[PDB]
Write a protein that binds this DNA or RNA. Structure first.
Lengths: 236, 236
DNA sequence: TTGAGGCATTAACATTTGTTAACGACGATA
DNA sequence: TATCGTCGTTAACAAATGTTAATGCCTCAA
């Protein structure tokens, strides 16, 4: 929040300008692997990859402020071939060429730390997410992904906790959890309404049994407490 | 590695000696979170997590030299609760308090980017591993882990590529793939043997059909090609 | 008004994986 | 030499997930 607004100013001071993006457009993609260092400031995006046979996989979401690097800071090679798609109405981000980056952090080390610590928030997130998705199969993958969605995009209402996301199609959750067919997601979600943990009203998902998800995403809930405690407190 | 050898003699110059560890020993653990920065220099270690009901989860391995961290750098708080177990006969690492690390890298930048580099290796590795494990279920998870081990512990031989690892039980593969019962991994393996993909020799695993594994782990193969290209060329 | 396309839902059927038990091989110990 | 404990197989049955198809609800567009 503040540590990011500080880094915001450091960029405008050295000539980096904010570029604006709209929904369904990607800052970088897997087919034009050019190494940048994106600093999303305001908006929602998802990192994705498309298999050789056209299978989509949503790896995670990013809501500003956050850092996303498509290349290494030493060798300037690609960290991997991925796409960062804008899913919110409009998003703003400070793009940087990895060339200009190493020279930019060598001056101020408190912003070096800022970027370094977010990279740590990335690793802990990946291990936590990987941990819970592997133990309980797909049923837990859904609950794990849901758990993440209620912390980052959740507000409390009398009918539960509303996930304030414009689009949550069944195939979109399946892509986040690794399920290929929407009928399989629906079957699982048909059980979560049955067991009375979630309900679908007002074109949104409302969670009524947060603990049920914590049981299938314990390492993930642990991650919010340690990495995003403010987000954690809003539901605890 | 040259970058690591420069780092080794940078810490010894500041009074940081190397502790010795033996197999089965935990450098840190999920129950006594001391926020360290481990510069594992020689040896093999697995990062593990245990649930409240006692389910082991092998998240990944670490071949020295590398960098593991149990705490952030600014907040200096934990990044999650994991155990770093030594699995070789002996391993040599430099334990340093997380606060100590802050000032050393503040002086030397070439060593700072090296630490930043290794974390970029971590992120890309986690997403690639998550990508290939979440698409093709367990069969793709088992086939994915084998692809990782062959690129790190694999040596060419006439029979096939031996995976040099002592005590690689059916359990350790399951732990590393989310499978909780040895009968389930043996069944998957009973097929990969029937399909002329691997062999059991001298209580070891020889891989004969590398391309098969590459079908179920393209992002991981991609990662070794972009992140650890030296170790990649050995099998191409 | 009709009709097209997309998303949610369910069915059914096939395949995988979860789960337990029983068997046999290998080691180790007395 | 017999006996126990670990680990790899396979079997058998339950549960979960892959997969396809059909149906119904909703928007959109003419």
């Amino acid at each position: 929040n503040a540590q990011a607004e500080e880094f915001k100013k450091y960029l405008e001071t050295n000539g980096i300008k904010p570029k604006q993006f709209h929904k369904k457009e990607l800052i970088f993609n897997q087919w034009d692997p050019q190494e940048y260092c994106i600093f999303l400031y305001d908006g929602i995006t998802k990192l994705t990859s498309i298999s050789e046979n056209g299978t989509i996989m949503n790896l995670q979401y990013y809501k500003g402020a956050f850092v996303i690097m498509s290349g290494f800071i030493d060798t300037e090679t690609s960290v991997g071939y991925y796409n960062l798609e804008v899913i919110s109405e409009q998003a703003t981000a400070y793009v940087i060429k990895i060339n200009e980056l190493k020279e930019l952090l060598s001056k101020n080390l408190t912003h070096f730390f800022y970027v370094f610590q977010t990279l740590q928030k990335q690793v802990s997130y990946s291990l936590a997410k990987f941990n819970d998705f592997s133990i309980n199969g797909k049923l837990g993958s859904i609950c794990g992904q849901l758990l993440i969605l209620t912390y980052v995009y959740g507000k409390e209402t009398p009918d539960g906790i509303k996930i304030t996301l414009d689009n949550l199609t069944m195939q979109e959750l399946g892509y986040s959890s690794g399920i290929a067919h929407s009928s399989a997601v629906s079957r699982i979600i048909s059980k979560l309404k049955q067991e009375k943990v979630i309900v679908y009203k007002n074109s949104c998902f409302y969670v009524q049994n947060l603990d049920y998800l914590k049981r299938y995403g314990p390492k993930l809930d642990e991650w919010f407490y340690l990495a995003c405690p403010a987000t954690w407190g809003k539901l605890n």
